[PDB]
Design a protein around this ligand. Structure first.
Ligand code: DEG
Length: 158
């Protein structure tokens, strides 16, 4: 079991940590959602799917910078929505193919009020999302840590 991002960065068998830089809506009014769709950025596969089933969870989803201070909302994982920042481990998704498949995680965030200008700075840490992978085979329990950075400024206007 291993992962990679849309920019080609791999996290190998056994886990590790990678930086993901996300493009964001440049202007988000009060009353609008900012969506951070990591399902278009992070992909994984099962290396031996004929004999092993891999189980994958969002173990923890943490908010930083302007996302922690200027926004509020939820995380959708697979077919269900949860508080973000997270207060629990999600249920398991099955990976059962060697073709990379999306990690089905998206943040749906809304402005808590206008910041007066820049609500998320370009290059700032906005989230840390921990993917936990186990299986039905041995006692592997690996963490793939995704540090999410804003690629551009997000303004919540007055
Ligand atoms: C004998 C299995 C060696 C490869 O083990 C790896 O591949 C399998 C299948 O993806 C995973 O379940 C496991 O955690 C490792 O990432």
């Amino acid at each position: 079991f291993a992962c990679k991002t849309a920019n080609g960065t791999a996290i190998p068998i056994g886990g590790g940590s990678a930086n993901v830089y996300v493009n964001l809506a440049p202007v988000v009014n009060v009353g609008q959602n900012l969506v951070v769709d990591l399902s278009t950025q992070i992909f994984c596969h099962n290396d031996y799917p004929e004999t092993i089933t891999d189980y994958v969870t969002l173990q923890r989803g943490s908010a930083y910078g302007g996302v922690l201070s200027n926004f509020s909302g939820t995380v959708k994982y697979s077919g269900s929505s949860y508080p973000f920042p997270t207060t629990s481990e999600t249920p398991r998704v099955v990976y059962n193919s060697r073709t990379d498949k999306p990690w089905p995680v998206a943040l749906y965030l809304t402005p808590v009020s206008s910041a007066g200008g820049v609500a998320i700075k370009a290059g700032s840490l906005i989230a840390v999302l921990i993917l936990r992978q186990t299986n039905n085979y041995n006692s592997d329990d690996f963490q793939f840590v995704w540090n999410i950075y804003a690629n551009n400024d997000v303004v919540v206007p007055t």
